[model samples]
Target chain A: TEIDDLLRKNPELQKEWKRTVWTAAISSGVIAYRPPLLERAFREFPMETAKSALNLFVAAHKSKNRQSVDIITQNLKDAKTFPLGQLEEEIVTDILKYPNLLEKLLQTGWNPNLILEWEKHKSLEILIKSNGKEFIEKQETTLLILAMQNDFIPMETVQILLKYGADPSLGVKRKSEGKEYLLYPLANINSNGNTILKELKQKTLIDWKK
Target chain B: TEIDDLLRKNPELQKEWKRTVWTAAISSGVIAYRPPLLERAFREFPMETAKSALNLFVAAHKSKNRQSVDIITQNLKDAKTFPLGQLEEEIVTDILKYPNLLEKLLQTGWNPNLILEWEKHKSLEILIKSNGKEFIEKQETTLLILAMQNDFIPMETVQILLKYGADPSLGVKRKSEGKEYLLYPLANINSNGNTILKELKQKTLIDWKK
Candidate 1:
């Protein structure tokens, strides 16, 4: 007998199966009109089902859909999801799509490292760039300082940040328990291909008439 | 009067004028037509000059501009540039563009480590894949062994090796201190992503059992 045979034998899964169906309906992006189905999936499976439902919405085609993210955002807010920090990371790194989705995530205290958090993955950097620089702010320094720390980002991206005066020495406040201190990343010192760094130093010397 | 005037006033830059012009002209992709200019630039400036002229052609508007890369490639092949190793690394890492350029490089006895050479940099990977699978293959456990040592050369690339029955445990020839030995890369111990590894392992088990 297969796993489905055991599921068929269980009386509880019969109820859960109906709830899964309703959850599937919600994931189809009609959550705007069908709020109650989202509730039922959680009520039936609690953590397991609700988590999968979020996963489903994220993996759903057309993730840039306003209604789908809006629905996930609405439900994620009111419900008490355990391990909230993990959920925040997932929402930002995974499901995050456009400005509207980002705006809603920010409302729930989603403070990303902006550049630092995305330094490892090119796709993630692309995510932020594609979302536009408006919401990320005129924090142009954030881009270059991040580029200094990371290697894989395109050189053009680095050049653009320099044009906006992202100084290698200047730093932003790093998150810490210590009294508001700045974390000057190593790249803030220099990167492997430090031509830009060299040019900057040359400019500083010429400006200072050294 | 302006920044241009400041640069002009410096007698320091006055002697440097020819170099700056040669660099600019090379960057414009018309270097092929200007033989004496190329020769004069190479003779006067040699290392510093040849290097950036190559860099400029690469970083210019048409990175793989037919005339630019051809002339540079032609010159590079005729007389290997100073800092030949650095120039080699640069050609692959940065300005490498088009199939013919890569073919010319290979003909110059430019053998890459295949794995460590491009494990992290996708641009180099792009260079390899863009040039097609032939050079990287001889049915050649060479490419597979390289892929196994390095991460990020897609799963299908590894599969092609296994399809060719490129055995994982098969250690290729190695030379050290004027002696030869078989060095089995760690990935050969498994981790052709482990998916293919496990699948192959399971098949062997079934075949043995049956």
Candidate 2:
């Protein structure tokens, strides 16, 4: 197998590299190579070359299948974990796929404690830091939907956003610069919904519709 | 393998149960069955039997790997269009293997959008609904660490918990019944940590330290 070839060439690689290489290979779609071939590639290749290959593989194949709203919903129903690396790369490839996933996840329900825990995830931290705008937009929608469905967004969820520098007043923007906006999800919810809307109007940092 | 035998006995079963049988056979530790035998098995088994066998196979032999985590992390990171079936199952298994996977995912320094989106995931929903004292206790450590490290818990995060029936007043009970009393994390933060304590006192949620 590739592992043998690599080991024969360079015996210095650590055992953990084997798992890392396997992960990179599968995620990168180098699935055609037998595990042995991957082992060889991981072992014999120069450390930099092997690392680069793995990185490239991860980047190229990431997010290959994260767009089906139905599949995400089904997985959520089963309490399944979303494949973050692959889907995340794919999402980066096409940022629009976010709303569907966001909508589905939010529609499921709210978990404050887990939400707090998830805040520490490396991938999530990166997502929140770099794509704060997109994340916040999707989150605003989620909050609205949650409020509509459950009649409230948890105080902890609100605190998470605030801590993350989410600007509740960063109203949705038009795609074209200088164009007037259509509607903010929060404002719409506040005007049309019942108690949730009223509560949001009274308590949220953002200005709600009158 | 079994496929060959199944084809010989009943071709219809092979045609109908191809994916199911193969997935099951692979999932089960039967990695080296003769192709003919597999074919035969596929051909002869009824659809239900094939499906059941596949389910049993996966249930028995599907082990979590690092690649599984990468795939999920990438998917989540990119917000791509990946299918949620196998990858979702793999990632959930991986998370189960490493209970801290969720926390790591959130800390990865990406967009906070996905974390926000996760509010609606069933895994999270179940975590919220179960609300066992043990779960909350485990969660408190994570939350406290994040708050201390990050300097603040997001308002949205706090809101999420408040919405999900997480009783802020629910304290961990000690072995000694006399000392077992409801203590809010927020209040405790005020008493224990100088930074958080000042903030909470400012909010009037707790009194100044005695």
Candidate 3:
């Protein structure tokens, strides 16, 4: 007899199957999205089912399948536990496109101040680094300094990051001699008339060269 | 009084004038392209006048003005001396579009085998270097090996350089270890069906991998 037939014959084996093998299969998508199977798995192992639905949501989002993402998102509302903080790298890289998702994840207890393991910077610092066309002088440079050096970054996004307690007065230290350069964003910006430069000039206590 | 007034008043200054002051102005085109001024300069200082006309020809060629080039070319016809050999760097760099000019300069006694002072390569080698999109492995790499490394050098141009006695069997050396790598053009080429690769396979004694 097959494993399913054996499980039907034994009550103890059926309980063990729902906890481990069945949960693993659903999470990895070996037991893929049949609504009935997911509903049964949810009843047996609620937390695992929630995590599996979130995985499906991420997979669908990466493939840009709006319908599949919506279905997985709807199921995720009944999630027993949210491990959204574990997907920090993916969320950070795509924050520009899915800014609303950043807010949603933050509200669900994901820390925005968490240092990215791969990039060695915070979410705001990584966003500033994305605009680099020329040299990134210092890895530990302030978010505003990195943003100023870039040729193009959205001013509204910078403003949002500033509102979230990013320090503007912090100086970037050189890797070579360790001398600090206090960069005023409007002064370091490539173009004087750029929107980000204009925003920084108007909002900040630091003055710019006329 | 004007500077011509001083030259007219002194006979010794007139003899020295043709050799030094007048030649400098004519060569540097302070005298401009007035026909009478050029005729007077040519009669007074024939060699300097020939060099000036050549400079004018080069300037016209660079600007892509056919009418100006023709005017300079006609004046160059009555040249007592041809310093076409001195313009090897210019001719080598532009040999593709001006292939006929290569033949003309070579016939007028330009040394095709002379190593370029700035580029540190022969005319054929410089032509190969011009086709470089990626890293140039070594400075003293053979002409055929350099030609093979490039993506878009014409086989006909390669054939023309080969006709002028560029060696095919010589290999390129690594810069770090001084180890030689024998590159068969057909094997080294990015595309198997490239015309240059096919030409190299058919016209050469060296074999290619099937």
Candidate 4:
């Protein structure tokens, strides 16, 4: 409260006033995010507030601080797609480590297919590495094909994808050395990949050589 | 010759003299790795020499400079394990892109199982992601298991491992939360991973639930 008054009196310190106030409030464990100061911080620095809130939420989860976690969650859900679109790969990487929180983000309208620019990987691709069978099961054919095309995705993931209706007949177009390859999972694969082909052959007519 | 004379007279520049000399030689297209000066440089900075040679070899391959490529290859083969043990992840990542050169490294006795420390990924695991089916076919069971355990390695790699004699009955011991998990491919897997188990069942009597 004294620090807030000191900043309010100083014109130069008020330049990034809301950010400074929010930082002070969180650090001091201030009771009033219910206060007008907190409301104005949200109004002026919406993205910054959401970013800090997400980080606080992660820290709270690690410490099992349910009170702070609930506050951040409700605040973030209200913010919605505003912050999710601009999320960095590091933030997404951390979020993906928490399955419940990752699911909550999805329910809160985060796109699974969001491409992380710096790493050039889809959020779903990273999710596949960290045991994402439940999420994959709920997704449709396009997502199934994306999983199928991933060179590093596990064999079991392929089984789930195929079982859930990734069409072997469907292929993604890729270009190399001035030639386009209509690359199906079967055609792109080799001997190590033949078991999936065997299963597909049993289920459908696969002209694999073609 | 002129630069070597300058360094030879100056004791101050001789601290990392070998590294400086090798870098100069490589950059200037020095005709004499066969010379006594080059020989002394190799003796003093064996690892640095090997690292420079490998980078040159990679560059040569990219530029189709067959003469330089041959020189580096011969020098590296003679150096053997001196530098391979200390290779950084970035160097290995570049080397893994070239399959023929990778085969040459194997022939030069580079250990396939070398765990890259910074990344904590086995060199073979990275190889698996880069269309290493041919290399996988040549390896035995332990490497096969490593490939299988890699969460991001392709399904086809598992098929190669199985085809070449990876016994699924053998389980790797893993520990989590004070409990040891003797995890078989089937037991470690989920719905996405069932295809491999299905194939394993047809070939051998599998107590999959166990």
Candidate 5:
């Protein structure tokens, strides 16, 4: 059976398939399996059905993993299908809680194509709301600061900042105590430091004197 | 009479003239004025001398005002018949300790000509040395963060940082307590906070996955 072959070849693949199915069930907004392909796949092969079933199971499982057990159970019970609507939101939010997921997703290897498809179906705001904006925002800052500290941010972003009236000397507030402090990005030329400094020096906002 | 005339006509000009003369005296690496000129101006046609003196005074004044006090004094002392080498270094260091002259110089103007001249002289090393490497390095980070935070760092710096080994995930550390925290450059944009993210997202870094 095709399902059996898939399961036999990659046991983990089965879990992924199940997760995808569950996500589709919750997020697709379709109450029933209108395509029928999924229903047929579930019925035709027991092993394959088991594998495909894992998607919904995992999606629900992940939701439970994130929320309080009581909330998870309530949401699961209230779910339109298996992992739809509120349940889907819970699951997505749970997925985003893990820092590693953010790192992995941001990695170069992560399938941007898949992300793009997902993005098309959902607004960034919706996705953020579902996942939790705090974590995502934190990641954005962490990544950006890290790049600035190490000189990693791209030219396009730098240009955008300049155009928008970003002030280099505004002084970054300390995260913990909120103390104001100054740091210059261009003057430091360690390994790749000079390059960034030179580029920034080219900008009008920079006061090269310091 | 020239002094009286200057005071009567333009009091501010008189002050500027005095300031310029003092600056020239300090920067010329000499006594700043020839005894002959001073004598002629003071005793001869004082009014005519003052008017003519303004030209020479303005030249010297502008040069001194453009340069740092340390630079002025050092050059002046260097031009002295008695080379006060050791004392000059000590004096220069003392002057530097009191003020952030390098930063002041950078903030004063965007004189591409002067920057080019400084570059030609390769005198940036002198300023860099006085300012300290750590200070310079921090400046680079500050510039980019401000640019992103305020939306003003030039695109060139961003590109440079990417080329160099800037890691976007490292997060900026507070100077005092050194806590890890994240904040977007722009207060409004959350997910796609800055354009640098997209550029960085496309690039490959060894530790990006972390």
Candidate 6:
């Protein structure tokens, strides 16, 4: 009550006024919303989590994409997207599509590890060109964990991996089951291989042969 | 008057009436709150990001720890915590501290993927011993993407990660920063000796040397 009266007298404390209100609302454990209040809250506190939320909401609001609010709400608060960055599901999916973009992440970012590691993602050719050798030298565990069985990897990439001692004996513990197995890269080359392995050999081996 | 006053007589449409009032408030874009109003909104229409906001609130209220409500509210609707399953900061922080409890995430509600990944949290030793091989074996990206960069992995676990082809040269991009860097498992050892990595090396190495 005294704080309210004091705020009434000290008009200069407008930031405090808005902050005081939201602090209660945040404590009241509500949505911490009202777009106008949220926008002003970002300015008023400048850096509370509540304000951080406002900075995002206001940015999304400016984009005025009602249809994409969920995804926008999802990304804007991202450690990847918040400050002068733009990311969306399609953009990420597409970014992976471009071999250059994936390979060139090292050129723009200069993190040599981008040249030294393989991430388990959609495209493999980019990493092979950009950082494929490193995966071999480093024996990329991610390769074994995700792609060894998936049959998505270029057989050439798997060959490079096997050359560098990416162990084929390293197999998978069947998800929700106890069967552990590895997708032997060469045998999977249409040698009556398993379904997933046979298909991968077709894509990578057939193309490489051509 | 018919609908508003009719609501007073018709308890059957009770959820509808409060929702009607709140729908106006949601469009008004005010803080659509009321300990009472939140309850009925769920019953009437079942959803909105406006009421999506309502979902977590009611769930937290059911958990009913006022002081902890802020932390709960902050996380329940959040990205890493909300996506596959909801987790609390306290529960998470506590879970990491236990080893067998960690080793046994499978029996607790095995989302195979959940147990299969190693989330880089404040403790890696917990995860290393708890579910070490699982992360590498599973090619756990969701765990890594959301994981904090802390050198908590034990040497045995790191060894496991390495044996399985875990490429330490693979570093992470700067998520929120313009400056991108990698968290290479060893390069981070100095960072090539950063604070987190150096201490971990000292801890793990000293013990290994012993």
Clashing pairs in 3: none
lDDT of 6 by residue, A1-210 (tens): 233443365465456345444543322212122333334433454345333442333333333433223332332323322211222222223232222323333233322111122233533211112433444422133332333344433344444433344444443222226554443333344455467654664455335435
Which pairs, if any, clash in model 6?
A140-B165, A141-B165, A141-B166, B124-B152, B187-B192, B190-B193, B190-B194, B191-B194
Question: How many backbone collisions does model 3 have?
Answer: 0
lDDT of 2 by residue, B1-210 (tens): 222442465454344344443433433323212233333434454442243332222322233233333323332332112211212333333232322333333344322221111111244301112333332222122222222233333433433333333333434322336465433445444344566534643343233222
lDDT of 1: 0.41
The alpha-carbon lDDT assigned to residue B180 of candidate 4 equals 62
Q: What share of the true interface contacts does each candidate keep?
A: 0.00, 0.00, 0.00, 0.00, 0.00, 0.00
RMSD values, in order shown: 27.2, 27.3, 30.4, 32.8, 37.9, 25.6
lDDT of 1 by residue, A1-210 (tens): 122443364454455444443444333322323334444554564555455554435433232344544555555543233222334333433333333444444445443333333222233311122333333322222434444444333344444334444454556764447565675433233346666644454344234323
Model 5 vs. true fold: TM: 0.17
Candidate 6 lDDT over residue span B46-113, tens digit each = 44423344333333333342322343233222333222244433333333322222233323332423
Ranking by TM-score: 3, 1, 4, 2, 6, 5
Which residues of candidate 5, in runs, are more than 4 Å off? A1-147, A173-181, A184-193, A196-210, B1-210
User: What C-alpha lDDT values do all the predictions have?
Assistant: 0.41, 0.34, 0.44, 0.44, 0.32, 0.35
Q: What does candidate 4's lDDT look like per residue over B114-172, in tens digits?
A: 43233323555121223334333222223344444443344444444354445666655
DockQ for all candidate structures vs. native: 0.00, 0.01, 0.00, 0.01, 0.00, 0.01
Give the TM-score of each candidate. Answer: 0.23, 0.21, 0.27, 0.23, 0.17, 0.20
Chain B TM-score list for all models:
0.36, 0.28, 0.42, 0.34, 0.24, 0.28
Candidate 3 structure quality by residue, lDDT tens digits, A1-210: 133443464455445443444544445532333334444655666667667764544434544555544444445553223343233344334332333443344445544344333343434511112433333332443334444444343444445445554455555433336664544444534555666545563454243212
Q: What lDDT tens digits, residue by residue, belong to model 5 across residues B165-193?
A: 33433333323266544532223333564
Instruction: Residues B1-210, candidate 3: write the lDDT tens digits.
Output: 132543364454455444454544445432333344445665666677667765444434544554544444445543223343333444434433343443444445554444333233334411122433333332443334434544444455455445565455544333336665544433534455656555563454243212
Model 2 residue A61 distance off true place after TM-score fit, in angstroms: 28
- Chain B of candidate 6 achieves a TM-score of 0.28
Residue A154 deviation, candidate 3, in Å? 87
